[PDB]
Amino acid sequence: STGSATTTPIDSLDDAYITPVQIGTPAQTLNLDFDTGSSDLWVFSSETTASEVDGQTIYTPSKSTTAKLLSGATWSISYGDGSSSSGDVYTDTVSVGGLTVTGQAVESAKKVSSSFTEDSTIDGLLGLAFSTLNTVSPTQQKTFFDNAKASLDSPVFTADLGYHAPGTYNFGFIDTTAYTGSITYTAVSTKQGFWEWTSTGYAVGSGTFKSTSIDGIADTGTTLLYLPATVVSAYWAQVSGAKSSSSVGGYVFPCSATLPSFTFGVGSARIVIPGDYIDFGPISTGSSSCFGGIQSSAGIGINIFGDVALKAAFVVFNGATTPTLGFASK
């Protein structure tokens, strides 16, 4: 089997991407944030505290004839940005772009933190990291990809995120028309439950490539590119007036600037992030200071190849017995 679904930016900045997901019988369609940095499929629901719902579409398991309460099961997750959610668990039928999993754990939120409430466009998350990170207790549950894997034509999914435009998540096949050149594959460590890999270096604009190992995660659920302070400093040094602002919480730059590209290495291959992808707009409405899309990972504890980086590529998440990651230009 295969599946293919369009993923759409939630706003004019590409802060995140939503993909429609069918849950239950009859189908209830929710728009979920596919997140390769976590491993829980959770949704706003009829069980969510009413004051914590503000515009989201909810899953109502009582209206699904295939929903079953997973007795005694609870979940609770906290994300790197400080947001959180928690609740109970059902199993139900879940389909993405034509690909169906029966018995999928659907984690129904009883509580969500303010940042989720305040974002009416995201109805929940669909985790695509490794199932070892799944928070369901006392019996850990598998991700949608893990459940689908054996039925897929090939045990892979691909992320093709758009810049200010729709893109595609495919399951079970590689669309050879979706990228240019070849896909370069690189090793993955699953030791921390992530799609963790090592970039071979970087360049800023038309500058020379610096060969250096940068270990980090391919994370569709993080907006920005988080890299070591030395690298980030080297980038923003090429932008006149750019500085790290303690009050804003990162590098900012004059909105009148033309940003240089940023290149990252994947083995001997090179992925070029155009400068425009690094512009995240005014820090506050009407400001002429703009927020940067490349930020320091210091004090995160890990480098994160988030959407800023991933959207410059066609990305293969290869879930073979020994997982690997593939990157192509597009």
mmCIF file of C-alpha atoms in Angstrom:
data_model
loop_
_atom_site.group_PDB
_atom_site.id
_atom_site.type_symbol
_atom_site.label_atom_id
_atom_site.label_comp_id
_atom_site.label_asym_id
_atom_site.label_seq_id
_atom_site.Cartn_x
_atom_site.Cartn_y
_atom_site.Cartn_z
ATOM 1 C CA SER A 1 0.000 0.000 0.000
ATOM 2 C CA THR A 2 0.878 3.670 -0.206
ATOM 3 C CA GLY A 3 -0.515 6.998 0.945
ATOM 4 C CA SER A 4 -0.073 10.592 -0.247
ATOM 5 C CA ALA A 5 -1.388 13.749 1.448
ATOM 6 C CA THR A 6 -0.901 17.449 0.877
ATOM 7 C CA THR A 7 0.564 19.436 3.763
ATOM 8 C CA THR A 8 -0.166 23.176 3.999
ATOM 9 C CA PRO A 9 1.496 26.025 5.920
ATOM 10 C CA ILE A 10 -0.673 27.282 8.801
ATOM 11 C CA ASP A 11 0.246 30.928 8.193
ATOM 12 C CA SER A 12 2.217 33.300 5.994
ATOM 13 C CA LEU A 13 5.484 32.488 7.813
ATOM 14 C CA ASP A 14 5.392 28.680 7.478
ATOM 15 C CA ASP A 15 5.328 28.432 11.290
ATOM 16 C CA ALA A 16 4.095 24.877 10.905
ATOM 17 C CA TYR A 17 2.354 22.612 8.421
ATOM 18 C CA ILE A 18 -1.001 20.837 8.701
ATOM 19 C CA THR A 19 -2.051 17.664 6.933
ATOM 20 C CA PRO A 20 -5.625 16.292 6.913
ATOM 21 C CA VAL A 21 -6.126 12.985 8.731
ATOM 22 C CA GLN A 22 -9.262 10.839 8.804
ATOM 23 C CA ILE A 23 -10.081 9.330 12.193
ATOM 24 C CA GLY A 24 -12.933 7.012 13.065
ATOM 25 C CA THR A 25 -16.050 5.667 11.396
ATOM 26 C CA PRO A 26 -17.613 7.674 9.854
ATOM 27 C CA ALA A 27 -14.479 9.656 9.221
ATOM 28 C CA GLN A 28 -13.731 12.713 11.327
ATOM 29 C CA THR A 29 -11.159 14.833 9.505
ATOM 30 C CA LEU A 30 -8.675 16.718 11.659
ATOM 31 C CA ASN A 31 -5.720 18.795 10.515
ATOM 32 C CA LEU A 32 -2.647 17.484 12.248
ATOM 33 C CA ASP A 33 0.942 18.653 12.578
ATOM 34 C CA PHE A 34 3.140 15.798 11.304
ATOM 35 C CA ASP A 35 6.084 15.809 13.683
ATOM 36 C CA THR A 36 9.209 13.733 13.037
ATOM 37 C CA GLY A 37 10.488 14.933 16.427
ATOM 38 C CA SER A 38 7.876 13.163 18.558
ATOM 39 C CA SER A 39 5.937 9.918 18.649
ATOM 40 C CA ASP A 40 2.390 10.553 19.916
ATOM 41 C CA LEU A 41 -0.682 10.967 17.737
ATOM 42 C CA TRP A 42 -2.878 13.207 19.853
ATOM 43 C CA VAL A 43 -5.944 15.264 19.120
ATOM 44 C CA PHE A 44 -8.217 17.937 20.448
ATOM 45 C CA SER A 45 -11.381 16.112 21.416
ATOM 46 C CA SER A 46 -14.790 16.175 23.041
ATOM 47 C CA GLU A 47 -12.888 15.436 26.261
ATOM 48 C CA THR A 48 -10.688 18.537 26.096
ATOM 49 C CA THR A 49 -11.419 21.141 28.804
ATOM 50 C CA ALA A 50 -13.855 23.495 27.083
ATOM 51 C CA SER A 51 -11.997 26.709 27.984
ATOM 52 C CA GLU A 52 -8.883 25.248 26.307
ATOM 53 C CA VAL A 53 -10.574 24.796 22.930
ATOM 54 C CA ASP A 54 -10.700 27.898 20.702
ATOM 55 C CA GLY A 55 -11.576 27.066 17.106
ATOM 56 C CA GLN A 56 -9.959 23.662 16.705
ATOM 57 C CA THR A 57 -11.786 20.748 15.142
ATOM 58 C CA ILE A 58 -12.351 18.036 17.752
ATOM 59 C CA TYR A 59 -12.430 14.252 17.635
ATOM 60 C CA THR A 60 -15.521 12.811 19.319
ATOM 61 C CA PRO A 61 -14.858 9.116 19.936
ATOM 62 C CA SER A 62 -18.428 8.442 21.082
ATOM 63 C CA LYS A 63 -19.538 9.154 17.488
ATOM 64 C CA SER A 64 -17.070 6.659 16.018
ATOM 65 C CA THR A 65 -18.309 3.075 15.757
ATOM 66 C CA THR A 66 -14.737 1.765 15.574
ATOM 67 C CA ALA A 67 -13.396 3.677 18.592
ATOM 68 C CA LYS A 68 -12.495 1.617 21.667
ATOM 69 C CA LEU A 69 -11.229 3.069 24.938
ATOM 70 C CA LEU A 70 -7.806 1.697 25.734
ATOM 71 C CA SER A 71 -8.485 0.755 29.343
ATOM 72 C CA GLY A 72 -6.291 2.451 31.919
ATOM 73 C CA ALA A 73 -4.080 4.169 29.356
ATOM 74 C CA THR A 74 -2.989 7.767 29.779
ATOM 75 C CA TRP A 75 -0.518 10.063 28.070
ATOM 76 C CA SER A 76 1.291 13.294 28.836
ATOM 77 C CA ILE A 77 3.863 15.083 26.750
ATOM 78 C CA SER A 78 5.999 18.206 27.046
ATOM 79 C CA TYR A 79 7.679 19.711 23.992
ATOM 80 C CA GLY A 80 11.003 21.511 23.684
ATOM 81 C CA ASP A 81 9.192 24.851 23.416
ATOM 82 C CA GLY A 82 7.521 24.352 26.801
ATOM 83 C CA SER A 83 4.077 23.448 25.498
ATOM 84 C CA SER A 84 2.275 20.352 26.785
ATOM 85 C CA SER A 85 -0.872 18.242 26.607
ATOM 86 C CA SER A 86 -2.263 15.121 28.245
ATOM 87 C CA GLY A 87 -5.238 12.787 28.374
ATOM 88 C CA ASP A 88 -6.559 9.292 27.704
ATOM 89 C CA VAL A 89 -6.345 6.887 24.769
ATOM 90 C CA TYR A 90 -8.587 5.244 22.208
ATOM 91 C CA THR A 91 -7.811 2.894 19.391
ATOM 92 C CA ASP A 92 -9.515 3.721 16.115
ATOM 93 C CA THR A 93 -9.103 3.657 12.360
ATOM 94 C CA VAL A 94 -6.763 6.340 11.048
ATOM 95 C CA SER A 95 -6.171 7.106 7.350
ATOM 96 C CA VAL A 96 -3.673 9.483 5.758
ATOM 97 C CA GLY A 97 -3.991 10.202 2.073
ATOM 98 C CA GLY A 98 -5.519 6.806 1.278
ATOM 99 C CA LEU A 99 -3.381 4.712 3.644
ATOM 100 C CA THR A 100 -5.350 3.107 6.459
ATOM 101 C CA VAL A 101 -4.272 1.741 9.853
ATOM 102 C CA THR A 102 -6.794 -0.043 12.050
ATOM 103 C CA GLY A 103 -6.230 -0.139 15.813
ATOM 104 C CA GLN A 104 -4.141 3.045 15.836
ATOM 105 C CA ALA A 105 -3.672 4.644 19.268
ATOM 106 C CA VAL A 106 -5.447 8.008 19.148
ATOM 107 C CA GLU A 107 -4.498 10.027 22.178
ATOM 108 C CA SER A 108 -7.401 12.232 23.212
ATOM 109 C CA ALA A 109 -6.497 15.454 24.993
ATOM 110 C CA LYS A 110 -8.152 16.300 28.287
ATOM 111 C CA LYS A 111 -5.748 19.188 28.828
ATOM 112 C CA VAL A 112 -3.648 21.317 26.501
ATOM 113 C CA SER A 113 -1.329 24.244 27.223
ATOM 114 C CA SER A 114 -2.096 27.796 26.177
ATOM 115 C CA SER A 115 0.012 27.780 23.033
ATOM 116 C CA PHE A 116 -2.104 24.954 21.588
ATOM 117 C CA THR A 117 -5.384 26.630 22.545
ATOM 118 C CA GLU A 118 -4.186 29.877 20.971
ATOM 119 C CA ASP A 119 -3.496 28.165 17.633
ATOM 120 C CA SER A 120 -6.872 27.392 16.064
ATOM 121 C CA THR A 121 -5.273 25.851 12.954
ATOM 122 C CA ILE A 122 -3.682 22.795 14.573
ATOM 123 C CA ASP A 123 -6.085 20.067 15.721
ATOM 124 C CA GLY A 124 -3.323 17.853 17.105
ATOM 125 C CA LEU A 125 -0.021 16.161 16.292
ATOM 126 C CA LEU A 126 0.903 13.025 14.389
ATOM 127 C CA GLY A 127 4.279 11.788 15.595
ATOM 128 C CA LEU A 128 6.746 10.190 13.181
ATOM 129 C CA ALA A 129 9.827 9.753 15.392
ATOM 130 C CA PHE A 130 10.564 6.317 16.824
ATOM 131 C CA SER A 131 7.967 4.543 18.932
ATOM 132 C CA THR A 132 10.374 4.326 21.861
ATOM 133 C CA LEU A 133 9.471 7.997 22.576
ATOM 134 C CA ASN A 134 5.708 7.362 22.776
ATOM 135 C CA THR A 135 4.369 8.574 26.118
ATOM 136 C CA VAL A 136 1.396 6.244 26.586
ATOM 137 C CA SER A 137 1.394 4.557 29.962
ATOM 138 C CA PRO A 138 1.412 1.835 31.215
ATOM 139 C CA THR A 139 1.590 0.263 27.739
ATOM 140 C CA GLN A 140 3.612 2.203 25.156
ATOM 141 C CA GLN A 141 1.903 2.561 21.766
ATOM 142 C CA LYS A 142 3.220 2.550 18.194
ATOM 143 C CA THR A 143 3.267 5.463 15.736
ATOM 144 C CA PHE A 144 1.121 5.524 12.620
ATOM 145 C CA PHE A 145 4.208 4.853 10.495
ATOM 146 C CA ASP A 146 5.255 1.924 12.687
ATOM 147 C CA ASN A 147 1.791 0.381 12.399
ATOM 148 C CA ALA A 148 1.653 0.908 8.612
ATOM 149 C CA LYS A 149 5.235 -0.108 7.858
ATOM 150 C CA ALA A 150 4.738 -3.785 7.081
ATOM 151 C CA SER A 151 1.869 -3.084 4.685
ATOM 152 C CA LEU A 152 3.716 -0.403 2.725
ATOM 153 C CA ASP A 153 5.266 -1.115 -0.667
ATOM 154 C CA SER A 154 8.541 0.161 0.816
ATOM 155 C CA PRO A 155 9.104 0.972 4.517
ATOM 156 C CA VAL A 156 9.596 4.697 4.013
ATOM 157 C CA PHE A 157 7.902 8.036 4.217
ATOM 158 C CA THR A 158 8.934 11.268 2.558
ATOM 159 C CA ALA A 159 8.587 14.924 3.486
ATOM 160 C CA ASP A 160 8.414 17.554 0.764
ATOM 161 C CA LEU A 161 7.570 20.794 2.542
ATOM 162 C CA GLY A 162 6.797 23.923 0.552
ATOM 163 C CA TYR A 163 8.168 27.436 0.949
ATOM 164 C CA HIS A 164 5.111 29.621 1.419
ATOM 165 C CA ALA A 165 3.242 26.891 -0.474
ATOM 166 C CA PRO A 166 1.706 23.433 -0.101
ATOM 167 C CA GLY A 167 3.853 20.310 -0.149
ATOM 168 C CA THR A 168 3.455 16.567 0.268
ATOM 169 C CA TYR A 169 3.886 13.681 2.725
ATOM 170 C CA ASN A 170 4.127 10.316 0.977
ATOM 171 C CA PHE A 171 4.069 6.892 2.648
ATOM 172 C CA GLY A 172 5.424 3.738 1.088
ATOM 173 C CA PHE A 173 7.049 5.127 -2.063
ATOM 174 C CA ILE A 174 9.592 7.638 -3.389
ATOM 175 C CA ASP A 175 8.207 10.013 -6.030
ATOM 176 C CA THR A 176 11.167 10.243 -8.382
ATOM 177 C CA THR A 177 9.602 13.276 -10.088
ATOM 178 C CA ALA A 178 9.641 15.277 -6.841
ATOM 179 C CA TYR A 179 13.376 16.086 -6.685
ATOM 180 C CA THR A 180 16.367 16.903 -8.855
ATOM 181 C CA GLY A 181 19.622 14.959 -9.033
ATOM 182 C CA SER A 182 20.041 12.011 -6.692
ATOM 183 C CA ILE A 183 19.091 11.276 -3.095
ATOM 184 C CA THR A 184 22.106 11.104 -0.785
ATOM 185 C CA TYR A 185 21.568 8.788 2.144
ATOM 186 C CA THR A 186 23.238 9.245 5.505
ATOM 187 C CA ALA A 187 23.370 7.223 8.722
ATOM 188 C CA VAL A 188 20.805 7.559 11.528
ATOM 189 C CA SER A 189 21.157 6.939 15.231
ATOM 190 C CA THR A 190 17.894 5.988 16.925
ATOM 191 C CA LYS A 191 19.516 5.961 20.381
ATOM 192 C CA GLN A 192 17.537 9.043 21.492
ATOM 193 C CA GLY A 193 14.376 8.043 19.618
ATOM 194 C CA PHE A 194 14.908 10.700 16.925
ATOM 195 C CA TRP A 195 15.897 10.787 13.260
ATOM 196 C CA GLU A 196 19.375 11.820 14.374
ATOM 197 C CA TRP A 197 22.163 12.253 11.827
ATOM 198 C CA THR A 198 25.424 14.100 11.236
ATOM 199 C CA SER A 199 25.750 16.884 8.682
ATOM 200 C CA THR A 200 29.172 17.209 7.100
ATOM 201 C CA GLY A 201 29.379 20.999 7.291
ATOM 202 C CA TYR A 202 28.050 24.310 6.047
ATOM 203 C CA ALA A 203 28.548 27.402 3.957
ATOM 204 C CA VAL A 204 27.198 30.929 4.213
ATOM 205 C CA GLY A 205 26.135 32.519 0.964
ATOM 206 C CA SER A 206 28.817 32.087 -1.678
ATOM 207 C CA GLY A 207 31.463 31.478 0.962
ATOM 208 C CA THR A 208 33.677 28.422 1.151
ATOM 209 C CA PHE A 209 32.342 25.215 2.638
ATOM 210 C CA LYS A 210 33.467 24.403 6.164
ATOM 211 C CA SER A 211 33.884 20.690 6.760
ATOM 212 C CA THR A 212 32.756 19.984 10.309
ATOM 213 C CA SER A 213 30.484 17.372 11.879
ATOM 214 C CA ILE A 214 27.125 18.671 13.070
ATOM 215 C CA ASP A 215 24.972 16.094 14.860
ATOM 216 C CA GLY A 216 21.275 16.932 14.886
ATOM 217 C CA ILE A 217 17.725 15.771 14.285
ATOM 218 C CA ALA A 218 15.486 16.019 11.256
ATOM 219 C CA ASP A 219 12.398 17.551 12.871
ATOM 220 C CA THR A 220 9.342 18.548 10.826
ATOM 221 C CA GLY A 221 7.677 19.786 14.024
ATOM 222 C CA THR A 222 10.194 22.544 14.674
ATOM 223 C CA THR A 223 9.911 25.722 12.610
ATOM 224 C CA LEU A 224 13.502 26.902 12.610
ATOM 225 C CA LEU A 225 17.067 25.726 12.048
ATOM 226 C CA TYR A 226 18.929 25.451 15.351
ATOM 227 C CA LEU A 227 22.706 25.093 15.068
ATOM 228 C CA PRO A 228 25.827 25.615 17.178
ATOM 229 C CA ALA A 229 26.573 29.182 18.230
ATOM 230 C CA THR A 230 29.774 29.355 16.160
ATOM 231 C CA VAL A 231 27.856 28.478 12.993
ATOM 232 C CA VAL A 232 24.983 30.829 13.694
ATOM 233 C CA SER A 233 27.355 33.689 14.480
ATOM 234 C CA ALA A 234 29.158 33.100 11.194
ATOM 235 C CA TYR A 235 25.835 33.341 9.334
ATOM 236 C CA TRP A 236 24.453 36.498 10.913
ATOM 237 C CA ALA A 237 27.834 38.231 10.675
ATOM 238 C CA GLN A 238 27.124 38.446 6.927
ATOM 239 C CA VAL A 239 23.935 40.447 7.515
ATOM 240 C CA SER A 240 24.485 44.130 8.205
ATOM 241 C CA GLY A 241 22.810 45.159 11.452
ATOM 242 C CA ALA A 242 21.968 41.654 12.605
ATOM 243 C CA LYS A 243 22.423 40.973 16.305
ATOM 244 C CA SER A 244 21.434 38.561 19.010
ATOM 245 C CA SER A 245 18.717 40.128 21.125
ATOM 246 C CA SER A 246 18.299 38.866 24.665
ATOM 247 C CA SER A 247 14.870 40.501 25.006
ATOM 248 C CA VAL A 248 13.565 39.000 21.767
ATOM 249 C CA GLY A 249 15.287 35.659 22.429
ATOM 250 C CA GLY A 250 17.427 35.234 19.352
ATOM 251 C CA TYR A 251 18.992 36.823 16.323
ATOM 252 C CA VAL A 252 17.089 39.638 14.705
ATOM 253 C CA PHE A 253 17.947 41.593 11.579
ATOM 254 C CA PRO A 254 16.768 44.697 9.732
ATOM 255 C CA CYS A 255 13.682 43.855 7.707
ATOM 256 C CA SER A 256 15.273 45.769 4.804
ATOM 257 C CA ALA A 257 18.090 43.181 4.502
ATOM 258 C CA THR A 258 18.599 40.708 1.715
ATOM 259 C CA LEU A 259 19.626 37.507 3.437
ATOM 260 C CA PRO A 260 22.386 35.183 2.231
ATOM 261 C CA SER A 261 21.689 31.529 1.588
ATOM 262 C CA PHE A 262 22.835 28.810 3.959
ATOM 263 C CA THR A 263 24.187 25.507 2.714
ATOM 264 C CA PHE A 264 24.398 22.300 4.739
ATOM 265 C CA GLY A 265 26.275 19.106 3.878
ATOM 266 C CA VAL A 266 24.802 15.637 3.552
ATOM 267 C CA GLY A 267 27.803 13.437 2.895
ATOM 268 C CA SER A 268 29.420 14.913 -0.210
ATOM 269 C CA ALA A 269 26.117 16.498 -1.279
ATOM 270 C CA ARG A 270 24.932 20.010 -0.494
ATOM 271 C CA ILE A 271 21.465 21.394 0.278
ATOM 272 C CA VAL A 272 21.047 25.138 -0.293
ATOM 273 C CA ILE A 273 18.559 27.067 1.832
ATOM 274 C CA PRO A 274 17.719 30.284 -0.039
ATOM 275 C CA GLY A 275 18.073 33.455 2.030
ATOM 276 C CA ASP A 276 14.362 34.249 1.786
ATOM 277 C CA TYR A 277 13.595 31.018 3.728
ATOM 278 C CA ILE A 278 15.445 32.475 6.727
ATOM 279 C CA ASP A 279 13.190 35.566 7.024
ATOM 280 C CA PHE A 280 10.454 35.163 9.650
ATOM 281 C CA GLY A 281 9.148 38.701 9.497
ATOM 282 C CA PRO A 282 8.687 41.496 11.982
ATOM 283 C CA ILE A 283 9.269 40.657 15.653
ATOM 284 C CA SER A 284 5.990 42.414 16.438
ATOM 285 C CA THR A 285 3.378 43.917 14.158
ATOM 286 C CA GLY A 286 4.753 47.008 12.457
ATOM 287 C CA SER A 287 8.365 46.546 13.590
ATOM 288 C CA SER A 288 11.265 46.964 11.144
ATOM 289 C CA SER A 289 13.247 44.352 13.073
ATOM 290 C CA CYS A 290 12.757 40.835 11.739
ATOM 291 C CA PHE A 291 13.225 37.463 13.338
ATOM 292 C CA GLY A 292 15.904 35.141 11.995
ATOM 293 C CA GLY A 293 15.257 31.596 10.831
ATOM 294 C CA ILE A 294 18.657 30.294 11.914
ATOM 295 C CA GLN A 295 19.118 30.363 15.693
ATOM 296 C CA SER A 296 21.565 29.016 18.276
ATOM 297 C CA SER A 297 21.038 25.563 19.710
ATOM 298 C CA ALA A 298 23.080 26.410 22.801
ATOM 299 C CA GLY A 299 21.016 25.410 25.792
ATOM 300 C CA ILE A 300 18.660 23.266 23.693
ATOM 301 C CA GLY A 301 21.127 20.420 24.053
ATOM 302 C CA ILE A 302 20.758 19.296 20.459
ATOM 303 C CA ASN A 303 20.920 20.726 16.960
ATOM 304 C CA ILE A 304 17.604 20.754 15.101
ATOM 305 C CA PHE A 305 17.170 20.625 11.339
ATOM 306 C CA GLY A 306 13.643 22.005 11.415
ATOM 307 C CA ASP A 307 11.365 23.220 8.642
ATOM 308 C CA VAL A 308 13.736 26.014 7.496
ATOM 309 C CA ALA A 309 16.245 23.335 6.492
ATOM 310 C CA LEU A 310 13.893 20.503 5.545
ATOM 311 C CA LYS A 311 11.761 22.598 3.183
ATOM 312 C CA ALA A 312 14.851 23.184 1.020
ATOM 313 C CA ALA A 313 14.976 19.421 0.371
ATOM 314 C CA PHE A 314 13.134 16.306 -0.547
ATOM 315 C CA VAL A 315 13.621 14.183 2.562
ATOM 316 C CA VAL A 316 13.390 10.387 2.838
ATOM 317 C CA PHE A 317 12.754 8.849 6.203
ATOM 318 C CA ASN A 318 13.831 5.251 5.565
ATOM 319 C CA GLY A 319 12.458 2.921 8.213
ATOM 320 C CA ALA A 320 14.292 -0.167 7.042
ATOM 321 C CA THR A 321 15.734 -2.486 9.699
ATOM 322 C CA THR A 322 18.670 -0.091 9.822
ATOM 323 C CA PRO A 323 17.030 3.310 9.375
ATOM 324 C CA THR A 324 18.664 6.027 7.256
ATOM 325 C CA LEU A 325 17.823 9.522 6.020
ATOM 326 C CA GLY A 326 17.917 10.701 2.432
ATOM 327 C CA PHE A 327 18.180 14.251 1.122
ATOM 328 C CA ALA A 328 17.794 15.568 -2.405
ATOM 329 C CA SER A 329 17.638 19.040 -3.856
ATOM 330 C CA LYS A 330 14.347 19.956 -5.552
#
